[PDB]
Ligand binder design. Structure first.
Ligand SMILES: [Cl-]
Ligand SMILES: [Zn+2]
Ligand SMILES: [Zn+2]
Length: 174
């Protein structure tokens, strides 16, 4: 197995996958680490049991799906892919807003709040999860305005959207 956490790339108390060489801190894995197979493995098994699941889909159909166990897993994995990027640190914990010339968002949102909501089964459809994730980056863009720091929200949103299209097999388009 790897000697560093797959998500944050640090050493420490690591739990090892039994079906692949990845390792994880307890609370870096999503769900929190519970023979054991990691979320990467579990996602791969879904694809292998249903190869047609990789044919292209419409985003509108994906968003209306109820959060059954396989969609719950795919959202957990998508959330984990965002935490895998180091720039997720800016969006992980609860933000506060006191900048001259700006007003904070009406509905603040952050990654650890989405993690908790997933863990507590608060989303009934994929749309709920995706709306909250996109809201993180939209709030950031609106608040920081012309500050170059706005770019961090564009960057991490791009990671979210690329992984969304991959994990839920969104039909490729020009
Ligand atoms: Cl922010
Ligand atoms: Zn970690
Ligand atoms: Zn694994």
């Amino acid at each position: 197995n790897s000697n560093i956490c797959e998500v944050c790339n640090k050493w420490g108390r690591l739990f090892c996958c039994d079906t692949c060489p990845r390792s994880f801190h307890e609370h870096c894995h999503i769900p929190s680490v519970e023979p054991w197979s990691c979320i990467f493995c579990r996602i791969k098994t879904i694809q292998e049991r249903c190869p047609e699941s990789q044919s292209g889909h419409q985003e509108s159909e994906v968003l209306m799906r109820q959060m059954l166990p396989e969609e719950q897993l795919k959202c957990e994995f998508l959330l984990l892919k965002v935490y895998c990027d180091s720039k997720s640190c800016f969006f992980a914990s609860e933000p506060y807003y006191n900048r001259e010339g700006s007003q904070g968002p009406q509905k603040p949102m952050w990654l650890n709040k989405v993690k908790t909501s997933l863990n507590e089964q608060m989303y009934t459809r994929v749309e709920g999860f995706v709306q909250d994730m996109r809201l993180i980056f939209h709030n950031h863009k609106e608040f920081y305005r012309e500050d170059k720091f706005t770019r961090l929200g564009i960057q991490v949103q791009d990671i979210f959207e690329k992984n969304f299209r991959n994990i839920f097999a969104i039909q490729e388009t020009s």
